[PDB]
């Protein structure tokens, strides 16, 4: 019984953590690389 | 027929290797097919090769059950031998009786002094299609191996919560009519492979009012097998339980008959890998 419970709670914890880390990675990618490319675009005009 | 079956398996796996080798031409011919369909420009790699388009003139007229079972799926009824391990106990002989009553077009063979090479040769030249070899542990049956015989696959399962019809009560006799089947959440490609293996040992096309049903319901890689009869009432449908119930777990599936164990493994249970208990149909 403790086997089944511990395995499934560890699987749930890992699947939550991977979603959370992937979320913060591509939110830092999208909503700050847009500003990086905007600065590069308005620096290419100079 | 020794040489015919050896060279036929040789030509089949040559054709399968040639398909996976030249399967890139299938999808890039698909690309230029839809490029003709909606008039969109064709890539550089598919635009500069002149030989593929002048083959596409020929190849414009090109276009479930899989390669071992596809030739005789609904055409011909199966033929199954059910045999035990060797010198079996009486509860394994009762279980082999119950499995030969589960599958129609199945007979049972006494096992003792039968080598597995010449047993396989005797089956696959007497014309049987499937072999079910049952293994026990002090009465309690622990494994069953299904071998499809014209060099087909073997699926090896373990059996886990086995309650037997001989063990319960004199509840009567079985039905032996061609049953209906139920497969619950076999979702991956290994799931469809195991479904095709487990269901091409039943007769094609039962009656629409065939009053017995047998279910293979997947619950996290543990196929619960129950068998039920039914009679549809005015308000629902009344299910009675008949015949054995167990849970089979596939641990191996390889691509030859039972005798060699030099066959290529399609799937086998990686038990000790680091991410073992995290996925199903692993």
């Amino acid at each position: 019984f403790e086997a089944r419970q511990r395995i499934e709670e560890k699987n749930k914890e890992s699947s939550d953590y991977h979603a959370k880390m992937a979320h913060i990675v591509n939110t830092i990618n999208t909503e700050e690389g847009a500003e990086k490319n905007k600065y590069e675009r308005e620096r290419k005009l100079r | 027929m020794l040489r015919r079956q050896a060279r036929e398996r040789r030509e089949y796996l040559y054709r399968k290797a040639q398909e996976l080798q030249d399967s890139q031409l299938q999808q890039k011919r698909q690309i230029i097919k839809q490029a003709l369909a909606q008039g969109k420009p064709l890539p550089k790699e598919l635009a500069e090769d002149e030989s593929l388009q002048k083959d596409f003139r020929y190849d414009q007229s090109l276009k479930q059950v899989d390669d071992e079972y596809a030739a005789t799926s609904g055409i011909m009824d199966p033929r199954i031998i059910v045999t035990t391990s060797r010198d079996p106990s009486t509860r394994l002989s009762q279980f082999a009786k119950e499995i030969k009553l589960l599958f129609p077009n199945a007979v049972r063979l006494n096992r003792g002094n039968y080598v597995m090479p010449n047993l396989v040769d005797a089956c696959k030249k007497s014309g049987t299609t499937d072999l079910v070899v049952l293994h026990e542990h002090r009465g309690v049956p622990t494994s069953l191996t299904i071998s499809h015989f014209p060099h087909g696959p073997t699926a090896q399962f373990s059996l886990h919560n086995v309650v037997m019809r001989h063990d319960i009560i004199n509840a009567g006799n079985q039905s032996e009519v061609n049953p209906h089947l139920i497969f619950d959440n076999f979702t991956t490609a290994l799931g469809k492979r195991v479904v095709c293996i487990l269901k091409h040992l039943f007769n094609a096309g039962p009656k629409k009012d065939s009053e017995r049903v047998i279910t293979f319901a997947n619950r996290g890689d543990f196929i619960s097998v129950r068998q039920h009869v039914y009679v549809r009432t005015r308000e629902g449908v009344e299910i009675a339980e008949v015949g054995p119930r167990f849970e089979m777990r596939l641990f191996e599936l390889r691509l030859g008959t039972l005798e060699n164990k030099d066959a290529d493994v399609e799937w086998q249970l990686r038990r000790f890998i680091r991410t073992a208990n995290k996925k199903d149909y692993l």
Partner: protein
């Protein structure tokens, strides 16, 4: 302008009339019209991304007969 069947019929009107009511739609086009029609479509699709030195390869004809072919065609 973005009708595909209409514009294909427009630019393959010439060789349909050369190798023929009439048929124009594929699943009804018999041999030499079908081969040259499909070849024309594949050329027009592949002329965008393919290289200009690799899409339209001429058949190798000798010099003194290709020049005579060109002179009689220009005549």
């Amino acid at each position: 302008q973005n009708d595909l069947e209409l514009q294909q019929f427009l630019r393959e009107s010439h060789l349909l009339s050369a190798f023929n009511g009439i048929v124009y739609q594929d699943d009804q086009v018999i041999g030499k019209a079908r081969s040259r029609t499909l070849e024309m479509r594949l050329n027009r699709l592949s002329r965008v991304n393919g290289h200009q030195d690799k899409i339209n390869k001429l058949e190798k004809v000798p010099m003194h007969i290709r020049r005579g072919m060109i002179d009689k065609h220009v005549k």
